[PDB]
Specification:
It is an enzyme of class 3 (hydrolase). The protein is mainly alpha-helical. It has one domain: Lysozyme, CATH 1.10.530.10. About 30% of the residues lie in helices and about 5% in strands. It is built from four helices and three strands, in the order ααβββαα. The protein has a three-stranded antiparallel beta sheet with strand order 1-2-3. Helix 1 crosses helix 2 (about 25-35).
Length: about 130
């Protein structure tokens, strides 16, 4: 499912992501935009052979099991197919785990190189949330 900008923001707020570990809702929308483009089915193979899954392009190396990432962990205890569901609940649950560590939303390359430092608030602008 390809989300709308505001639709998604609204859904993430519902899931306890607005200012989660100090990161306002616009940061999360911005990340989704440049990670998946709001498409929950986005998958992307990494050079190391791990695969990024879903709306927030969560990685098989650490967070989920795709059954083909040798030497990996599954710290969110989920199949990576759980991350392509149009119900964003496992993506968001697993995001809270990733951001709660020590590198924050710097774990998301697209956030760091495309959101960090921006007027991220623009991503929830004109959204009835």
């Amino acid at each position: 499912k390809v989300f709308g900008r505001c639709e998604l923001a609204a859904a993430m707020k519902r899931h306890g992501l607005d200012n989660y570990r100090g990161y306002s809702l616009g940061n999360w929308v911005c990340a989704a935009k440049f990670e998946s483009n709001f498409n929950t089915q986005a998958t992307n193979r990494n050079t190391d052979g791990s695969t990024d899954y879903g709306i927030l392009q969560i990685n098989s190396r650490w967070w989920c099991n795709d059954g083909r990432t040798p030497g990996s962990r599954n710290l969110c205890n989920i199949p990576c197919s759980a991350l392509l569901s149009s119900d964003i609940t496992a993506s968001v649950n697993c995001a809270k785990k990733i951001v709660s560590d020590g590198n924050g939303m710097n774990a998301w390359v697209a956030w760091r190189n495309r959101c960090k430092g921006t007027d991220v608030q623009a991503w929830i602008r004109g959204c009835r949330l």
